[PDB]
């Protein structure tokens, strides 16, 4: 006997050890990240983070380093970002209290609002505006932090 | 000739910061044939509507000036238009590491969603891009601290 999970873990390990990020991702796509062994969370999260379209600036800004010392929450954050579950990544970021991760998740959430088809134009616009205001607030906080550190 | 009027309307929109309106005004036209200043308008408009903080948008677009080479403007227009293959080829021609890496990542996504490619061809392409990305990442880490000596 059926142990499809057991097998996918071995399979993702084989692909990861070869840097086959995309293939790791599709191997694991039907599986809940919260129940994965820590090494498998590591493989998946690394795979998502390695393939996230970040500019050099974004890259400098966000906590996108993943190691076998990195806390589970950071791995879950990047896995949800990777799966386009920005709502889930947003509330993780807030729990973590990582400013730039909240901002990054707010940006992905903005896109999802922009594309949402169930929302009317007015509810749409209101929400984008709420988001941009929150982003600007955090951006203001980052700037003031950097100002104090240069004093 | 409606082309000329599009350039004029895109200018009218650009000067009001109506970046997304600039983009739609020019959507049908080829970027290579556009006058330098319109390439600037379009490139800037794509950058100003990317998913980035305001500060990040400023940082990229403040680097795009009317003394900037046409190539950097074409790069951003391709990115903005999801012509990531084209952005990548240009990026390698420019020989700027950062633009190659960003374009690879966006190209990866183009492949990921390409309907014409078969199941197996898609995967082999992604496998290749994935390995290249690891290679750039390994070089990134090595530059950060060479640990000599
Ligand atoms: Cl993917
Ligand atoms: Na490989
Ligand atoms: Na970083
Ligand atoms: Na500029």
Author numbering:
A (entry chain D): 0, 241 to 390
B (entry chain A): 242 to 390
What does the study report here?
The membrane-bound EssB is an integral and essential component of the bacterial type VII secretion system that can contribute to pathogenicity. One of these is EssB, a 50-kDa bitopic integral membrane protein that is conserved among T7SS gene clusters in Firmicutes. The architecture of Geobacillus thermodenitrificans EssB has been investigated by combining crystallographic and EPR spectroscopic methods.
A higher resolution structure of EssB-CΔ, residues Ala241 to Gln397, resulted when the flexible C terminus was omitted from the recombinant polypeptide. The structure starts at α1, with Ala241 at the transmembrane border, potentially the continuation of the helix that transcends the membrane. At the lower end of α4, a sodium:malonate ion pair is bound. The asymmetric unit of EssB-CΔ consists of four molecules, which are labeled A to D. An average rmsd value of 1.38 Å is obtained from the least-squares fit of the Cα positions of individual subunits with each other. The dimer is primarily formed by interacting residues on α1, α2, and the loop linking α4 to α5. However, with a solvation free energy gain of −14 kcal/M (estimated using PISA; Krissinel and Henrick, 2007), the dimer is predicted to be thermodynamically stable. The extracytosolic E273C showed a major distance distribution of 44 Å, compared to the value of 43 Å derived from the EssB-CΔ crystal structure, essentially confirming the assigned dimer structure and ruling out the physiologic relevance of the crystallographic dimer contained in the asymmetric unit (AD pairing) with a theoretical interspin distance of 49 Å. The topside surface exhibits two large grooves, one formed between α4 and α8 and one between the helix pair α3-α4, above the dimer interface.
